[PDB]
Amino acid sequence: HHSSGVDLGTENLYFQSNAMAGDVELADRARRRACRLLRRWLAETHTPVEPGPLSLRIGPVRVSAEVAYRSPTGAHGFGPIRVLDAEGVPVALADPVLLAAACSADSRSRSLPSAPINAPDAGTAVDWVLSSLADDEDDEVPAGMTAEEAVRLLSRQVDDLPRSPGADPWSLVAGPLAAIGRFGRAGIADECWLLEVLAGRLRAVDDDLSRSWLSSPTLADRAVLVGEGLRYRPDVRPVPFDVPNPLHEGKSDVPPPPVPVLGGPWSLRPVEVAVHGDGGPDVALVHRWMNTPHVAHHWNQAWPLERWREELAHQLGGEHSLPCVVGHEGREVAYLELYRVTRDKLAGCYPYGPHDLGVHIAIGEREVLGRGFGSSLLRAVAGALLDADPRCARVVAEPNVHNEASVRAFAKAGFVREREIGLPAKNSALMVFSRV
Amino acid sequence: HHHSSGVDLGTENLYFQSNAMAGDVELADRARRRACRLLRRWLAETHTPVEPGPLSLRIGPVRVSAEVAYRSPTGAHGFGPIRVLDAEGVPVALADPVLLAAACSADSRSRSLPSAPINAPDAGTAVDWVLSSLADDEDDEVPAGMTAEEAVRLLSRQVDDLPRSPGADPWSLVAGPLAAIGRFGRAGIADECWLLEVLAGRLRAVDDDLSRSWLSSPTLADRAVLVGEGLRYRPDVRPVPFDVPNPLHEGKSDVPPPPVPVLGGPWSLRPVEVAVHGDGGPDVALVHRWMNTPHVAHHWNQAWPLERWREELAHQLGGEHSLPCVVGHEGREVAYLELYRVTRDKLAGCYPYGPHDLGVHIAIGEREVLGRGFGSSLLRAVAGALLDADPRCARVVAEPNVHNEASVRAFAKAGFVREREIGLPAKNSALMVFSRV
Ligand SMILES: [Mg+2]
Numbered sequence: 046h047h048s049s050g051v052d053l054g055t056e057n058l059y060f061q062s063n064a065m066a067g068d069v070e071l072a073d074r075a076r077r078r079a080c081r082l083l084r085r086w087l088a089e090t091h092t093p094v095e096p097g098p099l100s101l102r103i104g105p106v107r108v109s110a111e112v113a114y115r116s117p118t119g120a121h122g123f124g125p126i127r128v129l130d131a132e133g134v135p136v137a138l139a140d141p142v143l144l145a146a147a148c149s150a151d152s153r154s155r156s157l158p159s160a161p162i163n164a165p166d167a168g169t170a171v172d173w174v175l176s177s178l179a180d181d182e183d184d185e186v187p188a189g190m191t192a193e194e195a196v197r198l199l200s201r202q203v204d205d206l207p208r209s210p211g212a213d214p215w216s217l218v219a220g221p222l223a224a225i226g227r228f229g230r231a232g233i234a235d236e237c238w239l240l241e242v243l244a245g246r247l248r249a250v251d252d253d254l255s256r257s258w259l260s261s262p263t264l265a266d267r268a269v270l271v272g273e274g275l276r277y278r279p280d281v282r283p284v285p286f287d288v289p290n291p292l293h294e295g296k297s298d299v300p301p302p303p304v305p306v307l308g309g310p311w312s313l314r315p316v317e318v319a320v321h322g323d324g325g326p327d328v329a330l331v332h333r334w335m336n337t338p339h340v341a342h343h344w345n346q347a348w349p350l351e352r353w354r355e356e357l358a359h360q361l362g363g364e365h366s367l368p369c370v371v372g373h374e375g376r377e378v379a380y381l382e383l384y385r386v387t388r389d390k391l392a393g394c395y396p397y398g399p400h401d402l403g404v405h406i407a408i409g410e411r412e413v414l415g416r417g418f419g420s421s422l423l424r425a426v427a428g429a430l431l432d433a434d435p436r437c438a439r440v441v442a443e444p445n446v447h448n449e450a451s452v453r454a455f456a457k458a459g460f461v462r463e464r465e466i467g468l469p470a471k472n473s474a475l476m477v478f479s480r481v
Numbered sequence: 482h483h484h485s486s487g488v489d490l491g492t493e494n495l496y497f498q499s500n501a502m503a504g505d506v507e508l509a510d511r512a513r514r515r516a517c518r519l520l521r522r523w524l525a526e527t528h529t530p531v532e533p534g535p536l537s538l539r540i541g542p543v544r545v546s547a548e549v550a551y552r553s554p555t556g557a558h559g560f561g562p563i564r565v566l567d568a569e570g571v572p573v574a575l576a577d578p579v580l581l582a583a584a585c586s587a588d589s590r591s592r593s594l595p596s597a598p599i600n601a602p603d604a605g606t607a608v609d610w611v612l613s614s615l616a617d618d619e620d621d622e623v624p625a626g627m628t629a630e631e632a633v634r635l636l637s638r639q640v641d642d643l644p645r646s647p648g649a650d651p652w653s654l655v656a657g658p659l660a661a662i663g664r665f666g667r668a669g670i671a672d673e674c675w676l677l678e679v680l681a682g683r684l685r686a687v688d689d690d691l692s693r694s695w696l697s698s699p700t701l702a703d704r705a706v707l708v709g710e711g712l713r714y715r716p717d718v719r720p721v722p723f724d725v726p727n728p729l730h731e732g733k734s735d736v737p738p739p740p741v742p743v744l745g746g747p748w749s750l751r752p753v754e755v756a757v758h759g760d761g762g763p764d765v766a767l768v769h770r771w772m773n774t775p776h777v778a779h780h781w782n783q784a785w786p787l788e789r790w791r792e793e794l795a796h797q798l799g800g801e802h803s804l805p806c807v808v809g810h811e812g813r814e815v816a817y818l819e820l821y822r823v824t825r826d827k828l829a830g831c832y833p834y835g836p837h838d839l840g841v842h843i844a845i846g847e848r849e850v851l852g853r854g855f856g857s858s859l860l861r862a863v864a865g866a867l868l869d870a871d872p873r874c875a876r877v878v879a880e881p882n883v884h885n886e887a888s889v890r891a892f893a894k895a896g897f898v899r900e901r902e903i904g905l906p907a908k909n910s911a912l913m914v915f916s917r918v
Pocket residue numbers: 052053054
């Protein structure tokens with residue numbers, strides 16, 4: 046005699062409580078899924094990760110999470126992933142379809158409107174994740190596995206790599222390296238040690254691929270969230286991209302960027318930072334330029350004077366980046382950074398050569414000058430850099446695919462669009478000016 | 482220098498991380514409330530029947546199930562955990578709000594026509610809507626200690642703030658007093674049936690135009706946020722009106738079963754005969770065959786075995802709901818139809834029906850005969866004959882799937898009006914109305 050409910054006996058409580066028992070596991074399965082999505086998002090945007098708090102803008106939502114275990118292969122261990130409002134208050138847990146929707150919105154926004162990922166029949170990462178909820182969940186690393194059994198499995202996986210011409214180049218990331226990350230995250234063994242072991246198993250094979258996998262600074266992977274060429278029917282059609290090679294050494298002996306000499310109407314000199322006092326007029330020039338809106342809209346470094354003063358000093362003291370003032374017929378008009386790719390975030394994004402050089406550029410005095418000038422300066426700088434370093438194979442740049450005038454300036458200057466790449470705050474057109 | 486893949490831990494770090502972990506339980510409860518609100522709207526806007534106990538339904542690409550612990554007379558149901566099931570019935574996920582919003586969106590966009598606003602390349606989706614709302618201030622919960630008398634007090638004040646004639650928003654009743662009765666009921670503050678009675682009284686007193694309507698109409702206006710050809714999400718929903726059953730309405734009238742119409746001219750019509758003996762008779766055989774041909778099954782989705790159909794037709798013939806009939810054209814048995822009383826049908830929650838309203842589902846088996854345009858002529862003949870057969874019937878209706886546009890067009894050529902799109906448990910339909918006046 047309950048008309049809005051079911052009359053309860055102990056048997057009803059039993060049935061419904063049995064069902065409630067697996068919900069603990071269901072929540073853990075959603076946790077593992079959201080973590081997998083987040084690891085991919087970080088790899089595919091090449092976002093750096095350190096132990097401690099991670100805070101990210103993903104499409105329409107701010108996401109934050111504790112990085113409890115920072116993995117050398119990207120197999121990080123997270124605390125609860127939370128959505129924050131503008132003031133930093135948690136308003137939701139970041140469950141898998143939520144993340145899939147945020148990532149999809151961010152990614153579709155990152156690529157150009159005419160890109161395949163934005164075609165009307167392309168599907169979305171949400172369709173993909175939705176369609177996958179009933180797939181069999183993959184078995185977890187035995188929490189009690191020994192390091193020796195781990196090495197045992199890792200050797201069997203290395204040796205079962207086809208190593209034959211026409212092999213999948215991403216098989217190394219997808220196989221042994223993914224397994225290393227899972228062992229590390231389970232606390233089974235140190236991933237640095239497991240990578241050394243992996244290096245040994247590769248030096249023995251002496252194949253084509255094994256010598257390559259040990260020397261090259263990047264490896265092939267496959268992207269499932271970021272990439273202008275993605276499709277979900279409703280299953281994902283992944284697209285290739287490059288990631289840092291964990292087996293590759295740290296700092297090379299590559300000298301700092303050279304000071305080129307530009308022809309035509311252009312002049313170039315390094316930024317000067319006075320140790321004494323304000324920092325000088327070069328710090329002020331860059332600071333002024335960097336805070337104008339048309340520059341901040343691309344560089345997003347509208348910093349105070351002193352922050353810029355010590356950025357420029359830090360760069361000048363290093364071997365990575367060389368900040369310069371560019372003149373046009375006697376007027377200081379532009380700022381650029383010439384940088385060695387080998388010490389740059391670009392080093393994780395494409396199979397670079399050790400001397401590769403890149404250019405970031407900001408045109409400061411457009412407000413009173415310049416039309417057609419863009420391509421001319423870019424050409425002058427590219428050629429002059431190849432002249433200054435005969436061991437440099439190419440000059441490169443990564444304008445936002447949405448910065449269409451910049452992309453066109455680079456192409457008219459002779460850079461070729463090699464690919465789209467995913468970066469922490471944008472997708473870029475990778476423009477390459479090659480030596481011939 | 483002790484942990485390179487982690488942060489060195491002191492009690493202060495643990496303290497910081499545990500405070501943050503304290504609010505997560507409330508975050509999980511807030512996702513629970515959000516998903517429940519979405520499910521309530523989905524069930525209402527598709528007119529899916531709900532009873533206490535287990536509820537199971539297909540929403541787009543996923544099967545959803547939940548215990549209905551509290552079945553609300555106003556649809557403000559209380560659920561146990563909402564789970565996604567695979568094909569064998571194994572739970573594979575908890576149905577959190579954005580997951581629900583995505584399945585409902587996929588399902589709803591699929592229900593409406595490709596040309597509808599909800600399907601425009603520039604329209605929002607329910608996913609955009611739910612995403613954009615995560616940082617909204619959460620709505621106040623009903624005080625658990627509220628008294629029933631305070632509930633009556635608030636409910637009376639609320640009927641009094643109803644616009645009456647100026648403005649005349651028809652959905653104000655569902656959105657105001659009825660939504661509050663549901664929240665009071667769901668919180669356990671009072672029995673909703675009693676609160677509906679109280680509501681009826683406060684409404685007889687004013688005796689304006691709207692109040693007379695709200696007690697007499699078998700349906701009320703509500704606003705849909707998930708189902709509806711005209712929906713838009715401009716990171717915020719632009720709702721569309723639709724009708725829902727009126728909880729203040731009595732009904733249960735003494736309406737007879739469907740009458741047997743009489744078609745003249747080239748048409749004949751008679752009820753199906755079901756043999757008690759053996760196979761079921763020749764009429765069960767005809768219906769069974771027709772319903773399994775591909776062109777008929779593609780729409781009716783009842784390509785059943787002979788035995789199931791024999792018990793379907795018998796169950797209808799014994800009831801007061803539906804009357805299955807065989808239609809002849811110039812001596813050849815060519816079609817099957819069901820004449821049904823709307824008041825006993827799924828349609829009754831969908832539009833302000835009159836007690837004697839009649840419906841028609843039709844299946845053309847012998848397309849090989851009367852091969853072109855005769856469809857609308859049969860529909861017109863049936864509508865007129867049904868209006869003759871029951872002098873108290875106000876209209877003949879039909880609810881083809883909005884995607885079955887050939888059928889929609891045939892009904893319109895027969896004199897039916899495509900009055901609106903409606904949400905039904907398994908499809909959106911074009912409500913075709915052949916009105917007597
Ligand atoms: Mg009991």
